Amino acid sequence: MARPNPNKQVVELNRTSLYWGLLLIFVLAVLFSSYIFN
Amino acid sequence: NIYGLTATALFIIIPTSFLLILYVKTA
Amino acid sequence: NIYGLTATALFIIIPTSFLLILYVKTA
Amino acid sequence: GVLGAALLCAIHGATVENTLFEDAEETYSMVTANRFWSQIFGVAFSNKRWLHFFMLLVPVTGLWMSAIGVVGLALNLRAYDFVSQE
Amino acid sequence: MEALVYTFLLVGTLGIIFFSIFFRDPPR
Amino acid sequence: MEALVYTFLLVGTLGIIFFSIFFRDPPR
Amino acid sequence: MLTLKIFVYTVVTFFVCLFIFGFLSNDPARNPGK
Amino acid sequence: SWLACSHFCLGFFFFIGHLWHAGRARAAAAGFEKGIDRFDEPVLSMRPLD
Amino acid sequence: NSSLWARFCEWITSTENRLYIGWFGVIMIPCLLTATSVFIIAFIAAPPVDIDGIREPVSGSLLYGNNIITGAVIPTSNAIGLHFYPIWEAASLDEWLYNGGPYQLIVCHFLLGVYCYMGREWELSFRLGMRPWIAVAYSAPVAAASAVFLVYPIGQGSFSDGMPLGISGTFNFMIVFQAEHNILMHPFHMLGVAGVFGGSLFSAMHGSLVTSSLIRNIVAAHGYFGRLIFQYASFNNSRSLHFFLAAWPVIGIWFTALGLSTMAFNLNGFNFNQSVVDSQGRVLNTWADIINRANLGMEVMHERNA
Amino acid sequence: NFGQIMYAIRDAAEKQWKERAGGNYGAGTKEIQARNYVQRKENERKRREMFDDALAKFKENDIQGALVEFENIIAMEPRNFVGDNFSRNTPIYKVTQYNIACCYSMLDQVEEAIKSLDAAMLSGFDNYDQIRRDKNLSKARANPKFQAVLDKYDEPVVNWNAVKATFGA
Ligand code: CLA
Ligand code: CLA
Ligand SMILES: C=Cc1c(C)c2cc3nc(c4c5[nH]c(cc6nc(cc1[nH]2)C(C)=C6CC)c(C)c5C(=O)[C@@H]4C(=O)OC)[C@@H](CCC(=O)OC/C=C(\C)CCC[C@H](C)CCC[C@H](C)CCCC(C)C)[C@@H]3C
Ligand SMILES: CC(C)=CCC/C(C)=C/CC/C(C)=C/CC/C(C)=C/CC/C(C)=C/CC/C(C)=C/CC/C(C)=C/CC/C(C)=C/CC/C(C)=C/CC1=CC(=O)C(C)=C(C)C1=O
Ligand SMILES: CCCCCCCCCCCCCCCC(=O)OC[C@H](COP(=O)(O)OC[C@@H](O)CO)OC(=O)CCCCCCCCCCCCCCC
Ligand SMILES: CCCCCCCCCCCCCCCC(=O)OC[C@H](COP(=O)(O)OC[C@@H](O)CO)OC(=O)CCCCCCCCCCCCCCC
Ligand SMILES: CC1=C(/C=C/C(C)=C/C=C/C(C)=C/C=C/C=C(C)/C=C/C=C(C)/C=C/C2=C(C)CCCC2(C)C)C(C)(C)CCC1
Ligand SMILES: [Fe+2]
């Protein structure tokens, strides 16, 4: 087996990032569902 | 309109859950 | 069956989200 | 609840009886049992108090819920039929 | 039943706004 | 459409199981 | 479905042979401290 | 019916006996049948599982 | 030691894996994966099966208009019986499904998987140095599953008698079994009920005593138990108590599984019919007779064909 | 030094862990596990480099240094070790005590070389051809107890003597 990978990194995102993401998804949903239902 | 309901539900669940899992891991 | 769908959806959204809020606050 | 209670009784007895120390201090190795059950089943107990409280919580909840069901039946409120399938 | 879906989306968005207001992450 | 609801509930439960297995919190 | 039969047979035989040789590899138990 | 039932029960019980005695014999041969040594636990020599 | 075999063996046998694999895992994992995949797919979508083999299909798939509580994987059709029915012996995939092959596939793979799991439960226990016989305690549910899924069909001569892989199917199986054989009035099922109830009782009581004693002591809990009931000075040590906890339910389930297998060869429970007779020959009904009437109703409604 | 004597014969962090009394996993046990794992890793690392030193020096014919090095590598053998494949002994343990058994032969110590190769056999040095064939150990091979221990640990598969005797009768 190979040696431990040297360039292993972890992803992070703070509360502002979560709020931005949730708001984006919900805004896109409320905008597009009206046309999806048709 | 079942396709619309399932598409909307998937779009709400999968990405928001995705983000929530990452944030839970961060903290 | 609209009543069943709305009741089920409320029971999946409100409590699970409630737990998630507290856990986010803890960490 | 009842079947899970029997399951917990059997598993706890077997686990405690199969991780003894050779011969105060706890007789059985908690770390060994936790490792064993976390690698086989996937999740294993880490706190003794929580485990011995779970063994209490299961049957009580099961029988209380069955009692609520029997109360429901006492007034003939019975989950008898599915209208759609009928 | 589409109406209930629309109200659910709107109320959820309002909840996101409320949480963004009152539960802000303190800097650093 | 009830079938999709049932399947969603089932797969959601399996997801909870998966996360409880592989993403455990290291105690203390 | 001869093709599927042969595919299932070969996968099963591979698994069983590996299963056996895994144990044949293991060395016998012994007590060092005795 | 008597033959089949009696001999199935006896065969199953003797299979359980095989399981028990084989496990005990292997453990005794390995040397840790009496219990863990409480000083040199093989689990402790392994890294924490995360 | 870089040979493919060497590194593969090290990987499989290593405890570094999140879930220990072991050699038994080699057969355990793929079998369970096949069983669960086929089970999920069949439950979600599958055509009706001819369980009774007289061209009266029984819908059991979730997608064909039935609920979770009612959805089930119908057992193999009565026509095939004990014959081995993979895909490739079937004339076609549609006919394979109509007859009910996926139940046979699932049950075979599941039995192999559970046996291999029982084995790995010993193998890992040997690795860590702990005592080996946790598998023995596991032999009870495995024995019951084998009795329900394999031994009983063998006794009855057909695979259609195996427990359907569903909830309402399980209730139907239990009711039909009570109809054919007096499962309720059989001493081994009585021992099984005793085992389950005693397991629940002992789990609850032991949890209460230990959690109460854990304050910041076992002598106090021992005295508590001794003073509560007239019984005094038993299970003085944790070893005997924790062995008894494992010994009660395991023996109960062993006995109930053996009772099921015994009934597989038509050795029914007690038959107390016309047990009480007055003078000059009349029949006085007892509770066993009302049970018999219920069995009559179940059995007569079970025989779908003439 | 262990090496010299044998050639001649030719808590601060653990108090939290000592949670084990309370039957809890906790965090102290994790720290102890990590410390033990890293200590073990360094242990076999240094045993390996000591073995490299031993072979390099044996190439120089300094059997004294090779022997002290080989009686030192055995010294740090962990107690109650169960291998990944149920070995019960680290893989080096069997080879090193074979080489020391060779080295003892070079020292004209056949009597203790017999015990060294007996202990090598106990560890599961399943390779039987060289011990019979290797000329390097031939000096100690002359002793009858060498063949006695080889027989009790490598029995003839077929009793030619017994079958011939039965044929005679
Ligand atoms: C010929 C077969 C055989 C032999 C020679 C042995 C020999 C031994 N066993 Mg093993 N064993 C066997 C079969 C055998 N066993 C089977 C089939 C099982 C499965 C249940 C077991 C399970 C078993 C366990 C779990 C243990 C042993 C132990 C022992 C040792 C002590 C004997 C003992 O318990 O005291 C004699 C004990 C008694 C006389 C108590 C009898 C209690 C039973 C329940 C009586 C039941 C009688 C009843 C009428 C039968 C109804 C049958 C019906 C279901 C059809 C001894 C080396 C013990 C040990 O320490 O090993 C070193 C131990 O812990 N054995
Ligand atoms: C209150 C009354 C009462 C009570 C307490 C019981 C109690 C019991 N009955 Mg009886 N019964 C009753 C009334 C009652 N019955 C009546 C009224 C009828 C007639 C309608 C019956 C008819 C009846 C039959 C016909 C049978 C029972 C059986 C049983 C036993 C079930 C547990 C068992 O053996 O499974 C043991 C455990 C298992 C079977 C589980 C095996 C699990 C496998 C090994 C693993 C599965 C893995 C899983 C799929 C994956 C997990 C996923 C992960 C995410 C968690 C138990 C002793 C059964 C029995 O005795 O057992 C054979 C049986 O066959 N009963
Ligand atoms: C019906 C009651 C019941 C159930 C469901 C159950 C379930 C379980 N017990 C286990 C263990 C045990 N149970 C024990 C004693 C007992 N168990 C009892 C009663 C039960 N125990 C009783 C009464 C006792 C006392 C004797 C012991 C001693 C053990 C164990 O050691 C073992 C364990 O691990 O404990 C933690 C687990 C075995 C996991 C496995 O198969 O590998 C994993 C398999 C996986 C993940 C996938 C399998 C999925 C398959 C492919 C599904 C296919 C479809 C099936 C045919 C099922 C059909 C479902 C329909 C009926 C709806 C599992 C969670
Ligand atoms: C298409 C598909 C997927 C088909 C699926 C179809 C289908 C039928 C799905 C299933 C439907 C379904 C989910 C039905 C079940 C629903 C149901 C009835 C739920 C009941 C829920 C409820 C709220 C009831 C209340 C009663 C209740 C409290 C029950 C709890 C049961 C329960 C969790 C019991 C414990 C089970 C268990 C496996 C415990 C093992 C614990 C364990 C690992 C201990 C090991 C261990 C032992 C030691 O001794 C020590 C020392 C240590 C350290 C240690 O670790
Ligand atoms: C099938 C498999 C699944 C497929 C789907 C996968 C989806 C993956 C997730 C995609 C979404 C990710 C969202 C990240 C969200 C996020 O956290 O981003 C954060 C990012 C800035 O973050 P920084 O780089 O400063 O953070 C550094 C680190 O701390 C990490 O955050 O902002 C952006 O780059 C743009 C964000 C979207 C745009 C924001 C503004 C516009 C939208 C709001 C509009 C409101 C309405 C106004 C009009 C009414
Ligand atoms: C190779 C074998 C693979 C097995 C795969 C199956 C894995 C199952 C894992 C179950 C985890 C349950 C969630 C635990 C959540 C969790 O994090 O628990 C963690 C908990 C341990 O808690 P701690 O000891 O860390 O708690 C310390 C206390 O101080 C509290 O903080 O685990 C247990 O005690 C045992 C729980 C068994 C419960 C079994 C329930 C099984 C339910 C299955 C439902 C199936 C539905 C199917 C729908 C179709
Ligand atoms: C290699 C190996 C391994 C693993 C493996 C695995 C994990 C596998 C898996 C596998 C799998 C996971 C498989 C699966 C399979 C499945 C199947 C085979 C299925 C089938 C199905 C079918 C066939 C169906 C059909 C149908 C339906 C039911 C629907 C519609 C209709 C029809 C009829 C089409 C390990 C690492 C441990 C070690 C070494 C060995
Ligand atoms: Fe306990």
PDB file of N, CA and C and ligand atoms in Angstrom, chain D residues 3 6-7 10-11 37 40-41, chain I residues 32 35-36 39 106 110 114 117 121 134 137-138 140-141 149 163-167 170 196 249-250 253, ligand 3:
ATOM      1  N   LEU D   3     -39.061  -7.390  21.446  1.00  0.00           N
ATOM      2  CA  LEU D   3     -38.022  -8.180  20.794  1.00  0.00           C
ATOM      3  C   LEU D   3     -36.665  -7.497  20.902  1.00  0.00           C
ATOM      4  N   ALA D   6     -35.304  -8.247  24.375  1.00  0.00           N
ATOM      5  CA  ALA D   6     -34.686  -9.569  24.440  1.00  0.00           C
ATOM      6  C   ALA D   6     -33.331  -9.576  23.743  1.00  0.00           C
ATOM      7  N   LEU D   7     -33.246  -8.921  22.584  1.00  0.00           N
ATOM      8  CA  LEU D   7     -31.983  -8.815  21.862  1.00  0.00           C
ATOM      9  C   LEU D   7     -30.914  -8.138  22.710  1.00  0.00           C
ATOM     10  N   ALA D  10     -29.700 -10.454  25.556  1.00  0.00           N
ATOM     11  CA  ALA D  10     -28.791 -11.495  25.089  1.00  0.00           C
ATOM     12  C   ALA D  10     -27.428 -10.922  24.724  1.00  0.00           C
ATOM     13  N   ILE D  11     -27.407  -9.821  23.969  1.00  0.00           N
ATOM     14  CA  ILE D  11     -26.137  -9.261  23.521  1.00  0.00           C
ATOM     15  C   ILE D  11     -25.317  -8.777  24.707  1.00  0.00           C
ATOM     16  N   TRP D  37     -17.737  -4.429  18.865  1.00  0.00           N
ATOM     17  CA  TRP D  37     -19.076  -4.174  18.350  1.00  0.00           C
ATOM     18  C   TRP D  37     -19.111  -2.997  17.383  1.00  0.00           C
ATOM     19  N   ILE D  40     -17.836  -4.774  14.071  1.00  0.00           N
ATOM     20  CA  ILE D  40     -18.746  -5.742  13.461  1.00  0.00           C
ATOM     21  C   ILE D  40     -20.063  -5.077  13.088  1.00  0.00           C
ATOM     22  N   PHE D  41     -20.805  -4.601  14.086  1.00  0.00           N
ATOM     23  CA  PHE D  41     -22.131  -4.060  13.808  1.00  0.00           C
ATOM     24  C   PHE D  41     -22.048  -2.666  13.200  1.00  0.00           C
TER      25      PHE D  41
ATOM     26  N   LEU I  32     -24.913 -10.808   1.080  1.00  0.00           N
ATOM     27  CA  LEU I  32     -25.888  -9.874   1.633  1.00  0.00           C
ATOM     28  C   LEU I  32     -26.173  -8.743   0.658  1.00  0.00           C
ATOM     29  N   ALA I  35     -28.561 -10.094  -1.865  1.00  0.00           N
ATOM     30  CA  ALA I  35     -29.875 -10.284  -1.265  1.00  0.00           C
ATOM     31  C   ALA I  35     -30.600  -8.957  -1.092  1.00  0.00           C
ATOM     32  N   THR I  36     -29.922  -7.950  -0.535  1.00  0.00           N
ATOM     33  CA  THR I  36     -30.576  -6.670  -0.291  1.00  0.00           C
ATOM     34  C   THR I  36     -30.896  -5.946  -1.590  1.00  0.00           C
ATOM     35  N   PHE I  39     -33.873  -7.728  -3.075  1.00  0.00           N
ATOM     36  CA  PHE I  39     -35.032  -7.480  -2.227  1.00  0.00           C
ATOM     37  C   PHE I  39     -35.587  -6.081  -2.453  1.00  0.00           C
ATOM     38  N   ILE I 106     -33.200 -14.523  -2.975  1.00  0.00           N
ATOM     39  CA  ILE I 106     -32.965 -13.732  -1.775  1.00  0.00           C
ATOM     40  C   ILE I 106     -32.732 -14.639  -0.578  1.00  0.00           C
ATOM     41  N   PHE I 110     -29.340 -14.849   1.547  1.00  0.00           N
ATOM     42  CA  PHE I 110     -29.454 -14.380   2.921  1.00  0.00           C
ATOM     43  C   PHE I 110     -28.985 -15.434   3.914  1.00  0.00           C
ATOM     44  N   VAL I 114     -25.913 -14.864   6.527  1.00  0.00           N
ATOM     45  CA  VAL I 114     -26.036 -14.901   7.982  1.00  0.00           C
ATOM     46  C   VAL I 114     -25.091 -15.941   8.572  1.00  0.00           C
ATOM     47  N   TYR I 117     -21.713 -14.403   8.576  1.00  0.00           N
ATOM     48  CA  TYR I 117     -21.662 -13.393   9.627  1.00  0.00           C
ATOM     49  C   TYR I 117     -21.442 -14.030  10.993  1.00  0.00           C
ATOM     50  N   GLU I 121     -18.154 -13.321  13.427  1.00  0.00           N
ATOM     51  CA  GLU I 121     -18.303 -12.926  14.823  1.00  0.00           C
ATOM     52  C   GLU I 121     -17.352 -13.702  15.725  1.00  0.00           C
ATOM     53  N   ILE I 134     -19.253 -15.750  21.229  1.00  0.00           N
ATOM     54  CA  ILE I 134     -20.343 -14.794  21.053  1.00  0.00           C
ATOM     55  C   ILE I 134     -21.197 -15.303  19.900  1.00  0.00           C
ATOM     56  N   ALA I 137     -24.165 -17.394  21.119  1.00  0.00           N
ATOM     57  CA  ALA I 137     -25.324 -16.581  21.467  1.00  0.00           C
ATOM     58  C   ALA I 137     -26.064 -16.107  20.224  1.00  0.00           C
ATOM     59  N   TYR I 138     -25.346 -15.898  19.122  1.00  0.00           N
ATOM     60  CA  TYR I 138     -25.962 -15.500  17.862  1.00  0.00           C
ATOM     61  C   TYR I 138     -26.658 -16.652  17.152  1.00  0.00           C
ATOM     62  N   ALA I 140     -29.036 -18.404  17.977  1.00  0.00           N
ATOM     63  CA  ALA I 140     -30.483 -18.487  18.177  1.00  0.00           C
ATOM     64  C   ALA I 140     -31.247 -17.832  17.034  1.00  0.00           C
ATOM     65  N   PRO I 141     -31.088 -16.534  16.763  1.00  0.00           N
ATOM     66  CA  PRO I 141     -31.806 -15.944  15.624  1.00  0.00           C
ATOM     67  C   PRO I 141     -31.475 -16.608  14.302  1.00  0.00           C
ATOM     68  N   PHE I 149     -37.326 -20.137   7.078  1.00  0.00           N
ATOM     69  CA  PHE I 149     -37.137 -19.965   5.643  1.00  0.00           C
ATOM     70  C   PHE I 149     -36.789 -21.252   4.907  1.00  0.00           C
ATOM     71  N   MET I 163     -41.922 -17.975   4.912  1.00  0.00           N
ATOM     72  CA  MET I 163     -42.490 -16.709   5.351  1.00  0.00           C
ATOM     73  C   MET I 163     -42.324 -15.663   4.254  1.00  0.00           C
ATOM     74  N   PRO I 164     -43.397 -15.022   3.790  1.00  0.00           N
ATOM     75  CA  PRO I 164     -43.224 -13.937   2.818  1.00  0.00           C
ATOM     76  C   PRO I 164     -42.389 -12.811   3.408  1.00  0.00           C
ATOM     77  N   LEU I 165     -41.567 -12.198   2.562  1.00  0.00           N
ATOM     78  CA  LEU I 165     -40.663 -11.137   3.003  1.00  0.00           C
ATOM     79  C   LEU I 165     -41.411  -9.804   3.083  1.00  0.00           C
ATOM     80  N   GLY I 166     -42.398  -9.773   3.976  1.00  0.00           N
ATOM     81  CA  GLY I 166     -43.202  -8.583   4.186  1.00  0.00           C
ATOM     82  C   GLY I 166     -43.937  -8.669   5.502  1.00  0.00           C
ATOM     83  N   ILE I 167     -44.493  -7.528   5.911  1.00  0.00           N
ATOM     84  CA  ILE I 167     -45.130  -7.436   7.223  1.00  0.00           C
ATOM     85  C   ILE I 167     -46.475  -8.156   7.209  1.00  0.00           C
ATOM     86  N   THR I 170     -46.017 -11.633   6.771  1.00  0.00           N
ATOM     87  CA  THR I 170     -45.655 -12.312   8.010  1.00  0.00           C
ATOM     88  C   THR I 170     -46.890 -12.625   8.845  1.00  0.00           C
ATOM     89  N   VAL I 196     -38.804 -14.722  25.574  1.00  0.00           N
ATOM     90  CA  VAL I 196     -38.903 -13.325  25.160  1.00  0.00           C
ATOM     91  C   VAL I 196     -39.346 -12.449  26.329  1.00  0.00           C
ATOM     92  N   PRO I 249     -32.695 -15.904  27.195  1.00  0.00           N
ATOM     93  CA  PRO I 249     -33.345 -15.708  25.889  1.00  0.00           C
ATOM     94  C   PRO I 249     -32.807 -16.629  24.811  1.00  0.00           C
ATOM     95  N   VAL I 250     -31.511 -16.943  24.859  1.00  0.00           N
ATOM     96  CA  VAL I 250     -30.914 -17.788  23.832  1.00  0.00           C
ATOM     97  C   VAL I 250     -31.545 -19.173  23.858  1.00  0.00           C
ATOM     98  N   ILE I 253     -35.197 -19.000  22.509  1.00  0.00           N
ATOM     99  CA  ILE I 253     -35.300 -18.933  21.055  1.00  0.00           C
ATOM    100  C   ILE I 253     -34.821 -20.229  20.404  1.00  0.00           C
TER     101      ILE I 253
HETATM  102  C1  LIG K   3     -37.491 -10.563  14.711  1.00  0.00           C
HETATM  103  C2  LIG K   3     -36.682 -10.167  15.698  1.00  0.00           C
HETATM  104  C3  LIG K   3     -35.284  -9.862  15.547  1.00  0.00           C
HETATM  105  C4  LIG K   3     -34.637  -9.169  14.554  1.00  0.00           C
HETATM  106  C5  LIG K   3     -35.186  -8.534  13.356  1.00  0.00           C
HETATM  107  C6  LIG K   3     -33.176  -9.136  14.884  1.00  0.00           C
HETATM  108  C7  LIG K   3     -32.206  -8.526  14.140  1.00  0.00           C
HETATM  109  C8  LIG K   3     -30.789  -8.566  14.372  1.00  0.00           C
HETATM  110  N1  LIG K   3     -30.152  -9.200  15.336  1.00  0.00           N
HETATM  111  C9  LIG K   3     -28.750  -9.163  15.089  1.00  0.00           C
HETATM  112  C10 LIG K   3     -27.886  -9.751  15.948  1.00  0.00           C
HETATM  113  C11 LIG K   3     -28.313 -10.482  17.121  1.00  0.00           C
HETATM  114  N2  LIG K   3     -29.481 -10.810  17.712  1.00  0.00           N
HETATM  115  C12 LIG K   3     -29.200 -11.655  18.810  1.00  0.00           C
HETATM  116  C13 LIG K   3     -30.203 -12.275  19.617  1.00  0.00           C
HETATM  117  C14 LIG K   3     -31.554 -12.158  19.462  1.00  0.00           C
HETATM  118  N3  LIG K   3     -32.202 -11.497  18.382  1.00  0.00           N
HETATM  119  C15 LIG K   3     -33.517 -11.582  18.561  1.00  0.00           C
HETATM  120  C16 LIG K   3     -34.511 -11.009  17.690  1.00  0.00           C
HETATM  121  C17 LIG K   3     -34.265 -10.301  16.553  1.00  0.00           C
HETATM  122  N4  LIG K   3     -33.021  -9.829  16.083  1.00  0.00           N
HETATM  123  C18 LIG K   3     -33.826 -12.348  19.806  1.00  0.00           C
HETATM  124  C19 LIG K   3     -35.178 -12.626  20.289  1.00  0.00           C
HETATM  125  C20 LIG K   3     -32.611 -12.695  20.362  1.00  0.00           C
HETATM  126  C21 LIG K   3     -32.338 -13.450  21.594  1.00  0.00           C
HETATM  127  C22 LIG K   3     -31.868 -14.861  21.322  1.00  0.00           C
HETATM  128  C23 LIG K   3     -27.772 -11.757  18.947  1.00  0.00           C
HETATM  129  C24 LIG K   3     -27.052 -12.486  19.990  1.00  0.00           C
HETATM  130  C25 LIG K   3     -27.213 -11.016  17.881  1.00  0.00           C
HETATM  131  C26 LIG K   3     -25.976 -10.589  17.260  1.00  0.00           C
HETATM  132  O1  LIG K   3     -24.816 -10.755  17.620  1.00  0.00           O
HETATM  133  C27 LIG K   3     -26.375  -9.820  15.956  1.00  0.00           C
HETATM  134  C28 LIG K   3     -25.732  -8.464  15.995  1.00  0.00           C
HETATM  135  O2  LIG K   3     -24.943  -7.948  15.205  1.00  0.00           O
HETATM  136  O3  LIG K   3     -26.121  -7.748  17.091  1.00  0.00           O
HETATM  137  C29 LIG K   3     -25.724  -6.376  17.131  1.00  0.00           C
HETATM  138  C30 LIG K   3     -28.453  -8.405  13.800  1.00  0.00           C
HETATM  139  C31 LIG K   3     -27.885  -9.268  12.689  1.00  0.00           C
HETATM  140  C32 LIG K   3     -27.412  -8.418  11.526  1.00  0.00           C
HETATM  141  C33 LIG K   3     -27.265  -9.220  10.269  1.00  0.00           C
HETATM  142  O4  LIG K   3     -28.017 -10.074   9.799  1.00  0.00           O
HETATM  143  O5  LIG K   3     -26.121  -8.921   9.584  1.00  0.00           O
HETATM  144  C34 LIG K   3     -26.074  -7.656   8.893  1.00  0.00           C
HETATM  145  C35 LIG K   3     -26.936  -7.753   7.686  1.00  0.00           C
HETATM  146  C36 LIG K   3     -27.228  -6.669   6.947  1.00  0.00           C
HETATM  147  C37 LIG K   3     -26.695  -5.335   7.318  1.00  0.00           C
HETATM  148  C38 LIG K   3     -28.082  -6.703   5.720  1.00  0.00           C
HETATM  149  C39 LIG K   3     -29.141  -7.796   5.674  1.00  0.00           C
HETATM  150  C40 LIG K   3     -30.361  -7.366   4.883  1.00  0.00           C
HETATM  151  C41 LIG K   3     -30.993  -8.523   4.123  1.00  0.00           C
HETATM  152  C42 LIG K   3     -30.250  -8.783   2.830  1.00  0.00           C
HETATM  153  C43 LIG K   3     -32.463  -8.224   3.859  1.00  0.00           C
HETATM  154  C44 LIG K   3     -33.099  -9.227   2.916  1.00  0.00           C
HETATM  155  C45 LIG K   3     -34.559  -9.441   3.255  1.00  0.00           C
HETATM  156  C46 LIG K   3     -34.730 -10.391   4.434  1.00  0.00           C
HETATM  157  C47 LIG K   3     -35.249 -11.739   3.976  1.00  0.00           C
HETATM  158  C48 LIG K   3     -35.639  -9.784   5.497  1.00  0.00           C
HETATM  159  C49 LIG K   3     -37.079  -9.592   5.065  1.00  0.00           C
HETATM  160  C50 LIG K   3     -37.714  -8.453   5.837  1.00  0.00           C
HETATM  161  C51 LIG K   3     -39.224  -8.590   5.963  1.00  0.00           C
HETATM  162  C52 LIG K   3     -39.608  -9.529   7.086  1.00  0.00           C
HETATM  163  C53 LIG K   3     -39.850  -7.231   6.197  1.00  0.00           C
HETATM  164  C54 LIG K   3     -29.843  -7.811  13.436  1.00  0.00           C
HETATM  165  C55 LIG K   3     -29.898  -6.323  13.650  1.00  0.00           C
END
